[model samples]
Target chain A: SQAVVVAIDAKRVDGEFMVFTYSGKKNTGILLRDWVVEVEKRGAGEILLTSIDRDGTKSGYDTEMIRFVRPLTTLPIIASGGAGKMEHFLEAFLRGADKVSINTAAVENPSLITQIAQTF
Target chain B: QAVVVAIDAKRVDGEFMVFTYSGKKNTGILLRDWVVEVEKRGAGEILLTSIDRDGTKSGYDTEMIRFVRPLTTLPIIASGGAGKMEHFLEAFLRGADKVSINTAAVENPSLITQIAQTFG
Candidate 1:
């Protein structure tokens, strides 16, 4: 079978996981923890998890969520959303993200990818 | 790479000029010229925002959208200053392929549903 990447979009509000859909326009009723386990059971190759709140804010990745999800499954996690600089990428890796997916920052400064690659 | 260029434009001397560093630094490049250049450079999409209209909640700069729409065939996402549903429709009518709602959505969560039901 071909490899699959399960993409998750969620928002953290008052420590509760709120799964969002339609590019963060709607909130799905699914529980985040339960969904992760189901994906693991289904043998998905990787998880591309994005935090809706931090995205486009240029703050950083949701490391707290990364720490929360790392213990739940063995699948590699490709962190998406809120990577403003090289330090944010390093922080995601330090928080147990296998890869960091950049959007706004990379578009703003294309050299950031190379800089992070050289640094890491 | 499917490149999506994000341009923050502000009216400077009656001509839309690009701004960077979150609308702090003016690039002095004409919005009309930059849209065409990015398209020629192989950009798949353009997230065109008007710094003047951003956070104002008045409405999108449909004039800016109209100005840049004809310059390139790349899809344009009209961003900044979407206060109501009519604003989104106006953007579409002005030739924007998509509309980005941030402050409006945050201020009124039901607007997303209203938009989906109305537009979709």
Candidate 2:
């Protein structure tokens, strides 16, 4: 598929995960709901949402984070960051994530892939 | 006596992410499949890093530590996200044979003694 998945790096600021990008050592801030519309209008087929602070926590997915972004677009969302257990993946899915991305946990257990594939 | 297979990966929905070109690209490969191939190629150790936790310093992804340790008998080194002594301790407790701290060591040279006092 030629459709592109738009990955947005976000951080907590003023009670919301503010979107931003790093370029040449400077950070550019982006508004969330607006950016989603901008990208979808620009032809993004799906959304890849990642939380900078929650990325390596091994706690769990930010359900509110995904929930906040859920209504902005009808496109599928791949929630990234903070997956510690199998339940975390379920939490993301229950919160409306089309797919739950696992990095550190999966690295810890390769069988998680087979498990998620077979189960989820 | 040391051998290492470096894995640069991201989190994907079902398949644990495998990357290419020094973490610049996500190949969507299953970590299980990749680790099996890594062992088949004769690696005695695996060095795993969380792209999300590369510099956050919150802690090691213990879930990932726990996940990968049981995959093989090879010594595993958990790299990335070692901001404090507890993070190192958490890594070991979670099943990492060794925890590597680059950024934390450079940041706090005294951390060496702190880690050595407990698990070194």
Candidate 3:
């Protein structure tokens, strides 16, 4: 399946949905809303949505971003970044995310995948 | 760029086991299970190669493609083998979204054009 990865800076100013690059180190001066629509037009099968603000914070996924991007395109959204615990995954799913992506937590505890498989 | 999970698998006994270190070591993980894990971990696509058929130029292991096509929603890029244009056709028929040509293309550069003219 074709997928497009979008990283957004949660700290939007003046309602401009800014995109981040280099793992959120620099702003790309791109609008998330425009990009989402363009990728969908280009036939993207899914969107891997990452939160620059919440990534690696271990707090939770950027559910606000997921909700924001949900109606913008019909593509399935994979909520990425944050996700410290199982509840985070469920939270993203409930907030209109089709899937949750975990990296740090999974690397730290590989068995967490097994737990997630069993739970979800 | 989309995150692609490349897996080199070889038939061990009757089941396919993932190989690491250029097919030198077996990871003891079944191909079926690992495909599920990578999809859950947020892989956009899968590049599956058969170590046993690699470099043989006999043909692609279409059986591997058939086995894995239904295992995940990710697009499968069939690799290793691919001797001729007919081999590429067989791979697509077996459910590969794309086919990788390495040794055969290196040996016969015109083979690329032949396949592209027919399929591309």
Candidate 4:
């Protein structure tokens, strides 16, 4: 199967989580929407979308990307990468992202927890 | 006894970031993960830093502190932003148990000892 599940790796306690790499856009455009539909058809619980363009900018997640990916699937999506501030996390949720990933900024500023938790 | 540690899970080409205070984010490298593993293996400490803020003094990012703090039982040193008294207080209050000042210490000589004393 050229387009099939190669691996399954995501750790979550409460919410469902899944991450898949797509070769699209800069490398080669991929229809993430179709990928989601396929995953759902296979009974996948959730999905995680990470942009290779801005993997660790710490600026925040791409809201538009989430918006683009959200409608394609109904399962939960853990928006990974570019999540810098509390505001970014909130924005993700508003735009249909289920959860967020923390990288450099989380450690750079310890107050993010209060800021994020309070926002939720 | 003190230990130095760092964790930049935002990987590039399947490797985490490992930039220095000088500011050079290289891809296809293995230094970042190795550093942390070496420390853990040798029983030394790891110190995490934000490449985006190797010089800026905005305050500690709790996501890093809280995320890394729970990973290891060893002592953690919350650094990056110690610009003012409140930054120091916020770092501790937010969850960073210990503290250190880099650019802040250089800019305000009295702040280092002053902040430690302010807590007492």
Candidate 5:
């Protein structure tokens, strides 16, 4: 099966900006509005939104953060966040997340990944 | 004199797979080939890193070391994602003549005690 493994890997995508954000510890990319305009202008293939705060915490994700980001662009948005369990991923999808990136939970419970792929 | 067990190259070789942000996947050099090459240069030891269980840190990459152990006479240091102290011990108990820790020391500093205890 060919799975489209599109990870946000914000560390790589936002690396350029992150070097500067080190001082403030907050990376402010182009405003979502301008960012979409630029990505659309460049004909980007897609977008993946993630909350740096929720990362490594396994809290599922900040759906609110990606909700607004998704509407701005025509491309699909992959939401990355606190993936504590299978329900967390399900809830992310339920709460309007287009795609989910579950790292920590995947490491702990291989079954969580298996169950989701099998069920959904 | 360093004794290295070398034999016919595999007619059917397993592929070397590298998964990183970028690179020409580390050449899938055969285990016996690498040991013979190192031994020819008078190296007393060899190290084998499993890029498979890499960053995820789930910690089971013993089979690769075991596969290469009998193939070479030089000491082999098994390396790669030692997620926990138990993983290090597991590697030693299973077949790794020696274990090397890198990222886990950075990410999971607390595992050191359990590691020291396991080895003692």
Candidate 6:
């Protein structure tokens, strides 16, 4: 399931800007907003919006992107990138996120999933 | 001029191992040793986020922050688990030079000013 999402994401939509190459490190591209609209139109079930610049930064989700993408699609928007706290999730939801993704944080502290589940 | 080193640490066998393959593959490197090495490489700042704390908003991992603080004198911008104003204060109390507030600040822009005033 995860592989499917990545496969689609890896495909270059029209107007696609920046992307982490196959190596996943060397990266440069247009901000996500430039490619995301086409992603939605490319028959995506939903859009997983992860800010390449903000990923692993753990500051918070790119709410600006979330705000930008929210009105652009009716599909579920899973906000990713820069999730550093519970309030980040709240902010994402408020900005019209359908789900939030956390990879690094959950691995470092499994309790976070439980904590968020209980509190949220 | 700021080169930030982000450490993706996962605990295995009762020790934290460093990961660098987009936080996917662990290198079995001792985190403290890696920290020292990055300092030797002349990183301007350390953006420290506990994979567990990212987006948890429970609070910053003060234990890790305290642990890393003495490891280097370079300014450490603590990332992850910043939810409310109190979390900001706690990270500062634990010796974090700066706390990255993303979600909460986006939720309430006033948080930035509030934290600043409180810190003031």
TM-score of each: 0.57, 0.52, 0.52, 0.42, 0.41, 0.51
Over 4 Å off, model 6: A1-120
Model 6 Cα lDDT, one tens digit per residue, A4-114: 111111212353435443223334353445445554444334444556656666688778767866786776665666776767777888899876665455445434444
Q: Which residue pairs in candidate 2 have backbone atoms (N, alpha carbon, C) closer than 3 angstroms, thus clashing? A: A108-B64, A108-B67, A108-B68, A109-B67
- Please say which candidate is ahead in lDDT: 5 or 6: 6
lDDT string for model 6 (B1-120, tens) is: 123445666566777677743466776667788678666655455666665665565787888888888898877667666777788777778888767644343334465556655554
Residue B67, candidate 3: how far off, in angstroms?
0.5
* RMSD to native, candidate 2: 16.0
lDDT of 1: 0.69
True-structure RMSD for candidate 6? 16.2
Is candidate 3 or 6 superior in TM-score? 3
lDDT of 2 by residue, B1-120 (tens): 122355655567644677643355676676667767666545555667676676677787777767677677766667667788788778878877666654444345456556654542
> Which whole-number lDDT from 0 to 100 does residue B35 have in model 2?
69
Candidate 5 Cα misplacement greater than 4 A, ranges: A1-26, B1-120
Pick by lDDT: which candidate is best? Answer: 1
lDDT of 5 by residue, B31-106 (tens): 4555445444443444455655544466747776666677667665455556775677677766665554434433
Candidate structures ordered by TM-score, highest first: 1, 3, 2, 6, 4, 5
Docking class of 3: incorrect
Task: Enumerate the candidates' DockQ scores in order.
Answer: 0.04, 0.03, 0.05, 0.03, 0.02, 0.02
Model 1 misses residue B4 by how many Å? 1.0
lDDT of each: 0.69, 0.62, 0.66, 0.48, 0.47, 0.58
In model 6 chain B, where is the ten-residue run with the lowest total lDDT? B101-110
Candidate 2: residue A12 Cα off by (Å):
1.5
> Which candidate's DockQ is highest?
3
Error of model 4, residue A73, in angstroms: 1.1
Question: What shift in Å separates residue A107 of candidate 6 from its native position after superposition?
Answer: 19
